[PDB]
Amino acid sequence: MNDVIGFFNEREADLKSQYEDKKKFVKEMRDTPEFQSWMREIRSYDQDTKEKLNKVAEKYEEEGNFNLSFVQDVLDKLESEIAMVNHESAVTILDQVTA
């Protein structure tokens, strides 16, 4: 029984170490600063904006698109199409032309 109690104490020291470490990890995750920032951004949208973003969230996650990879790739694609294709003078000169 002496040996048995020693072994039990060792095994439960290991289990307590693991459980405490992961409980601390969860406490870090509850609430993680990234988690808090993402929640703040999510709740920062207005009514219609948050509704539309939630609908697009459903769309992307149905496609699996809702990830940093796809979102960032779309960002970079639009950035490449905008910066390379450099964009009242036109409208006013057109009006002068027409008159």
């Binding site: 029984m1 002496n2 048995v4 109690i5 039990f8 104490n9 439960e12």
Partner: protein, 49 residues
């Protein structure tokens, strides 16, 4: 750990069993030694003969 609590309790029980059985062995040894003493007294009586 809840299990370990009964482990400690019945470990104390085991130690008590050890102590009691050792004491019983000692007492039976004492009684047997007293029987031996009686046998030695009878030895001495025989020499008187």
């Amino acid at each position: 750990l809840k299990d370990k609590k009964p482990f400690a309790n019945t470990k104390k029980t085991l130690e008590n069993q050890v102590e009691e059985l050792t004491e019983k062995c000692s007492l039976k040894t004492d009684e047997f030694l007293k029987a031996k003493e009686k046998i030695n007294e009878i030895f001495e009586k025989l020499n008187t003969i």
